[PDB]
Design a protein around this nucleic acid. Sequence first.
RNA 1: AAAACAGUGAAAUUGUGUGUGGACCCGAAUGGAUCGGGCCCGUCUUGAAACACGGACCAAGGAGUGCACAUACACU
Lengths: 111, 165, 135, 154
Amino acid sequence: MEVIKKIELKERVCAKGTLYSHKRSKKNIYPRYSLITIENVKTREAAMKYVGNAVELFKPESTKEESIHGIIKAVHGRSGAVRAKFSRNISPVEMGSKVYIKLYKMNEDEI
Amino acid sequence: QRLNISNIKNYYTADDIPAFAEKLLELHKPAPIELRTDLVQGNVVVVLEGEYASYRVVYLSRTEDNKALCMGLPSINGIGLFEIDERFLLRTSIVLDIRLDKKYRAKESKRSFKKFNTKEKVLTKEENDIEELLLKEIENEKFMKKYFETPYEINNTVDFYEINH
Amino acid sequence: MDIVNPSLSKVIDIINKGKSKKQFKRFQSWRVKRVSESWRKPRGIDNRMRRKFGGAPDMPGIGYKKPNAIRFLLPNGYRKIMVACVKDLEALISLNSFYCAEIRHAVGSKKRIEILERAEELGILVINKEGKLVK
Amino acid sequence: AHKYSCDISEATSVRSQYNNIKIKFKNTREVCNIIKTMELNKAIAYLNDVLRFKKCIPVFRFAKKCGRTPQAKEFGTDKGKWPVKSVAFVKKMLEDLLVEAEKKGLGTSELVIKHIQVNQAPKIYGRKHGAFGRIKPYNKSPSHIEVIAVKREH
RNA sequence: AAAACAGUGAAAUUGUGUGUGGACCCGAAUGGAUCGGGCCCGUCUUGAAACACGGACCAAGGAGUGCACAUACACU
């Protein structure tokens, strides 16, 4: 079963993170950008080393497309969180989900 | 002039449109990507993407812009000769002393794949040759044979950029 | 039909994917069936759309108008001209680089055959080519 | 001619329709609703029990303020009724289709009520006199009916 | 008072079948739970979501016009 293999392949090679919010103020949301936390990264200086890296959301139960790709654009706040952009806008139903950080840089056009 | 043209056609001088077309094309042209410097013949590298991810392999050459050429060891880990984008490789500080005679080419390892190749494995003279070169450098060395067999696993308890390779 | 203007062939998809799909429905046309969807400007003393409160819909205006070069262009990269005679195509003979023809609905079968034969020899694109004449 | 409200083959089916019937619209559709998809011999048996007050018609759409009854439990509800006048008409209509089936050369068994529908016919006007010198309406609401039964493939 | 063609046959409204939702609109999406913003219009009024008035629903009809007399502007 290909899904079980594709997971183990990704698990061995990537860092792990979770999606927790869109970019927002107290009143309005900006769904083009999403906010991520990475496992053991806990300062803004530590987080700067990931700016530019590729990210992937893998979803095996999906009928349309099994994974969405994206890129980390900027650091956010002072405790090591980041801001990222994806080829499609993330649904509110997909918040709380697991994200993979891929250890190589890509250009803003590739996504 | 006939009445259909004296009214409808009048909206635009369309003879100008070529000039617009050029400017638009320019703007949406892709940005350039840099060819890296850090890799030397016979560097061991770890594969990060596609069907062969997690295995150690040996880098041979630049090929076609960002494309690079690598060999596994069909005896030791079963991976043959292939091509990949040079960014999908993690560098490590081990360098073998191999030198090759000529240029060779192989199938690309695309990032998106549907199915695993569990069967149907054969070798060319050049695959044989290159293995029978690489193997000599490996046989004489203590645990190197086993090193190529275990997949790589990232440490889940510390930040990646703290580690050295 | 799958045809494209040769001068824009490598650009047409950028153009098409860039066009807006916004609609400007009349206010409260969703509430009562007697008000049609066609735009009319609200003129009430209290009206929330005229006063531009956040959460009300947007109103039409000049800011939304497309660039002068792209405007009026069909998805195949040509502009259109209406025709009803053989003697109409004769006008397009200088303009066939950017314009294409669309035969008017009321022209009948026997006449359409004569229009299409002329279009072939002059080298003019007709977009209703199949039309009623499929049988 | 009549355009029946759905498309089923002439072979392996039997049909009837009537117009402007003088049974009451809302009562008739509650009857038709419950015998849909039922086998024809079962339908005729059930309708005989309703005439004898041994079983009831359950109500779902035209049902406000209706009485509760132990016979309704057979269809998972509390509310039911006994509309004798509509039942006598539908029963006659179904019995005639068994004559047609037999005469046409299908079996008298394995026939299932695949389609049945009721429509409103135009009103017949009437009047009642009220107090303070007023006159008010007192109209009648008739109906139109279609049925198609088919042979089970089994 | 109503009532033309034994033409065409819209909307309100009803039944049956198939799909999608629990008042609905705008912005953004998922294989899938939804997220953010929005009080009912018209009108008099310092001030209306109002415990101010008119509005059950659909079609069709429905309100700055003509002449005379001086006048300022544009055009011949």
